[PDB]
Amino acid sequence: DKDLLKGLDQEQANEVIAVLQMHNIEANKIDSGKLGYSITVAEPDFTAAVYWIKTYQLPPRPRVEIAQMFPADSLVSSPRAEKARLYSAIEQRLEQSLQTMEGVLSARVHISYDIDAGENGRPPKPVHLSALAVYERGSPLAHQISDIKRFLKNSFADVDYDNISVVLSERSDAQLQAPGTPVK
Amino acid sequence: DKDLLKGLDQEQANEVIAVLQMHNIEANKIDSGKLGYSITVAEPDFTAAVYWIKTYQLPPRPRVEIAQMFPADSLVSSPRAEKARLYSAIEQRLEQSLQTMEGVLSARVHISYDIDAGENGRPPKPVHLSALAVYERGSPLAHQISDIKRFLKNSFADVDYDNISVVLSERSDAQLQAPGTPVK
Amino acid sequence: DKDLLKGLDQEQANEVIAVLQMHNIEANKIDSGKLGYSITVAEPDFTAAVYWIKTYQLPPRPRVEIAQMFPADSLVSSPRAEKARLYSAIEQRLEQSLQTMEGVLSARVHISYDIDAGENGRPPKPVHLSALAVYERGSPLAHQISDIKRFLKNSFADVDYDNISVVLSERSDAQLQAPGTPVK
Amino acid sequence: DKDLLKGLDQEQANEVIAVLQMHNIEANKIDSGKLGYSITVAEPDFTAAVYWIKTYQLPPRPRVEIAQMFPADSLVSSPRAEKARLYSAIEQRLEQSLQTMEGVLSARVHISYDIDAGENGRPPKPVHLSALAVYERGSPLAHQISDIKRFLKNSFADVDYDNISVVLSERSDAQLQAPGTPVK
Amino acid sequence: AELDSLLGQEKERFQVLPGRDKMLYVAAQNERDTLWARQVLARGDYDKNARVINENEENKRISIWLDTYYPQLAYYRIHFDEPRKPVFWLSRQRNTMSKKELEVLSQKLRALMPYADSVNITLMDDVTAAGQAEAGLKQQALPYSRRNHKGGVTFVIQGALDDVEILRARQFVDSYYRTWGGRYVQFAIELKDD
Amino acid sequence: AELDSLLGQEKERFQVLPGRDKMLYVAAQNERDTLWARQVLARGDYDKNARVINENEENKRISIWLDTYYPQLAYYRIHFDEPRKPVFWLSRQRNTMSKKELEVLSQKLRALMPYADSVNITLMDDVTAAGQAEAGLKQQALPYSRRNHKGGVTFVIQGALDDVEILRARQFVDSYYRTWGGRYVQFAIELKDD
Amino acid sequence: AELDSLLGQEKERFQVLPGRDKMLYVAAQNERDTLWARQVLARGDYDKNARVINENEENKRISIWLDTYYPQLAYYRIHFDEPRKPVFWLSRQRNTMSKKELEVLSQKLRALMPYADSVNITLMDDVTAAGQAEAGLKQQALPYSRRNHKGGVTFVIQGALDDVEILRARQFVDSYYRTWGGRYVQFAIELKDD
Amino acid sequence: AELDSLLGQEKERFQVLPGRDKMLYVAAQNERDTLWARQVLARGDYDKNARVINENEENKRISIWLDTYYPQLAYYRIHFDEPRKPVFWLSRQRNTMSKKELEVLSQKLRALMPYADSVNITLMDDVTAAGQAEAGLKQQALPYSRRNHKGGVTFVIQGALDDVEILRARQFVDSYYRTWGGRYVQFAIELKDD
């Protein structure tokens, strides 16, 4: 009934309703054509819903990787810019691959960017990398930690089993349950 | 009834009402088309609401990261400008990843910018980094401090457990409760 | 009945329904012509389905390999860019070949990118590589680990049986079973 | 009856039906003119068929060799690009030749790419190579391993009988049997 | 209307409690169900007062009352598995209260929990509390050092713990504080270099 | 309607259980079938209450009840192969409970499992539990070191384990915790360099 | 109108108090509820005077009165858990007041708190106050040095404290000043290098 | 309709089995025929319940039942060549079961296999099992080392095995586990450098 967000694109609008129906208030993804989607909540829950817009900082910012800020359209693209979008595409591609393991729902991978190794006239640092992973319920999480940590060791040149930091966490409880319209 | 803010865009207007309904005065996000939103409060609360515009410094300034001031449209983009938007995209991407841990509502990550290491002819400084994190109620905050501090250690090349400063704080009380129209 | 995703292309739309019918809600791939496909679910399951859009982060991002970010249309293409799309095409081609072994449904292959070996004035590092593999049910997975690890050893110049990390996992249970329309 | 894939070209559409009729659901390759083929399955099997689109990752990506990413239209084509499409054409041509042996249905050949031998100022590495091969039923596979391994030894300059890794596997059971329309 | 239907479709997730002071109570299980049930009661109407209680917050609410009216009380945790009557553990060793006023203490707490029938005060030995905390933390193969004090122990855990042991630690600690509370044993997972 | 048809086409995947406290139960086999059956009951209507129980979650739900009302209880795992009556293993060695209150313990658990007929409490020796865990882990040819404790053992597995042995490990561990649970034997596959 | 409905929907958050001097009082719990209830009474109308009192501000308001009319008084903190009658702790050791004028002191405070029924003055030993502050601050494993004085102690905490111990410190300090106030024990978390 | 015609054109590939508990069973031969026959029964209708059983999955299903109700049982593999009555091998050496309850064991398994007539329990010597595994693995000319254990042997195979011997290995191992199962002999083809 009461307007709460306007002009959202698609993947931002589907995330907000996922947050809201977690906290027991229903929303209505009203498309407004080329002016983006719109989310309207009922009047007794406009109070509670604008709280959860604040804490989760909804709508979500577009998920940024490093190579979006080195586009190389027609610029000469200095050798720092090549390793910037090189490793950034490797951050994305290892993320795409952990997501297709057994039971990993989602994943995030970061790479340590030793970039100025040639400019200082020094041998480069060892590559460090971090990983996040969301498993199912019921999986014994203390044993899939070894598969990931074995996997993306040899995805880089000089890493160890100490430069890999994987903190994997099982997913939340399933929201399968209808929130409910308020009473009159 | 009384006009209080005009011409706001979307995420600024949703933040002001979140502040105002925290302090028990209702607002009305009146859209004015292409001239931005507008927030009007009632006449007995125009006094109190313009106080909370002052203390919170509403409307919020647009949330700035470092790479907005190195756009590189067609300029030759000196090697300081590459590491400026390189690390700035890493500040954003680690922020996007802590936000998808277990229970973190929001996060902020800063990176120490040792930039002039090559210009001074010196080996670079160790990387220092800071992190903020907003957890749920009920979480035992003294133990999720180790997960973050383990996570973004190995997201960079040469850091320690002393160059990482994470000050995480649980969220406020939930504002789920209707403020109320004034009496006549 | 209720709109859930619009404007999807083909291989993104077929993946979402595969996720949704896994979790017992039916979808309807409604084509909208040149404006892409559309997925609509019924009203009692719009709540549950927008949860599984969030956890799986549907619609899937386009599957990225490294050579998509070195297109070489008319640019002079510095010698880092040649080894970037060289090894990336080898990552794809070994992936295409493991997929045609006995019982491998799908595969992913990553190569360690030692790129700056000539710029540092050093001999290059040994090549490390990782592999994922989805077998059938009933296969004894502890013995097809040797075939892969023998296969793509000699697909590169200087690798060992320690630089190869293959973590292969059998596929899930078959979803052959109709979800079901809700009751009225 | 229900639409499942649209806009496929020819060799992608013939592969999907080969996968589907393996798993006992019939398809219908409906040509749509210049808008590519289309595959429609019946309504009780749209559930099961969209599972096997997911696991096999159908439609198949176009089979990539290394020389597709070094086209050399009018660019000066640095000496790395010549050995890239040189060895890649040798990968294809040895693949075309193993396929015309006695009983080999299909074959894949990879070559180790020692490319930066001249740039490091070093003698090049020995050439390593891998081979896949799909034989008939009934062939004694432990003896055709010697023919291949003798054949493409002397197809290169400095290889051994240890740099050749051939893992050959007989073909699956023949799918000669009609799947069947569902009952009404 | 019926609060079992004013809440969600699943009846097993909540359990309404007709308290003695005319207010009805609904017992959530965690902080998602609490925000599920504090959303209903603040958005709209139940034709009486209604108040969501939690297991880990009402436990903390009593301790804000209990440290004033009973300081120097050695207790672990109150337990709301059967929320009609809670089981409120105490230290057998560090409590000099006689059985007279301990029954008064089972009646002072009922003034704070109107939904409760009668508090089942039992006693647990402090050596059993620190025992299972130690007999689990070395059963997870974790480096530690038990330092004792007059009225509590402390298990500081240090070293460069990697990921396999940093996650066996947290699902032991959170499985301990769910059981015993955190008023007698403090786990210090202090993670530094060598 | 009939819940055997409100669920999917395959009847053998689920098994409905008419519990004693007016609520019906449906026993899934894993966490795909649980989300298959918790989807039906939360989307729509069965004309009575219905509640999906799992083998590895209802096992964990009892232990949230069981550590309060029976701490210092040495047990392994409850088993729902025939969900009409579960087999709840205990330590023969570490249980000082007499046969009087052990039959009370077969009646306290029935208040938690209304679908259950009667709990079949049996006893397993702790040397047999740690035996088959050791007699399998060296049968997979894995480096380890058995460290014992007062009330549990621990098999830490270390070294630079490559892929053939890292996968023989997990299909032994997950084939052990499916059988014995994880309350007496902890496997520490801690994987580092040399 | 009724002030229980002139405030928000939740009745349990506030507690109105019909004071003796014709003015009504409403007891908030923290500084969000105070600005919730000081917004209502200043925006509009209640058909009588109404005045929001807090737990941590009315405590400080009395001390502005109390240091003039009773200097050299050793007291900790007044407590508004049951705001009909507050419990006002004093030092048993550092108070030479006899029981005659201490009952006068239970009547001087009632002139400041009209909502109060009768002040429950009790006594706490100063060694118990500094004890639990010390027995918690070493139970959090924190470096310190107890320096005593004539009429108060001081726990200066120094060193390069990292994040795990800087946050165990603040939820002990803020859990201490909520209990005892800050008039006898001062925590100096002074954070410098080595 | 007739399930022999509801399946494919070839009658010899499947074999329907009228089980005793009103459910009909169809015995596939491998995991292509299982997905051939689990496609028919889940897509549409047979006018009774029908359930596809496999040779290598129903073998594994019994062991999920058998490790609870008979732990410390030494058996190899159940065999479904004539699926009307299976031949279930046991260790003659490592089984202390008498012939009384072994006939009970031929009746406990019939409750799991309703299609079965009567289980043909026979005994195989453990030295014959490890014999043919050793007498084949050196007949393929493969380097190994037989390490024995109390209740199983292990043939670790190492070295830089090239392609001719890596493929004689797998068609011996897969020809062994098809015959004897994998519960007494484990082959470790662990392939490293020199």
mmCIF file of C-alpha atoms in Angstrom, chain D residues 26 45 179-184, chain H residues 43:
data_model
loop_
_atom_site.group_PDB
_atom_site.id
_atom_site.type_symbol
_atom_site.label_atom_id
_atom_site.label_comp_id
_atom_site.label_asym_id
_atom_site.label_seq_id
_atom_site.Cartn_x
_atom_site.Cartn_y
_atom_site.Cartn_z
ATOM 1 C CA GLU D 26 11.928 -38.078 -26.153
ATOM 2 C CA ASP D 45 9.110 -34.960 -18.677
ATOM 3 C CA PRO D 179 12.355 -43.810 -25.371
ATOM 4 C CA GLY D 180 8.587 -43.717 -25.535
ATOM 5 C CA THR D 181 5.810 -41.169 -25.342
ATOM 6 C CA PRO D 182 4.232 -40.793 -21.881
ATOM 7 C CA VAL D 183 0.885 -42.355 -21.034
ATOM 8 C CA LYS D 184 -2.315 -40.326 -20.859
ATOM 9 C CA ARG H 43 6.827 -39.635 -15.166
#
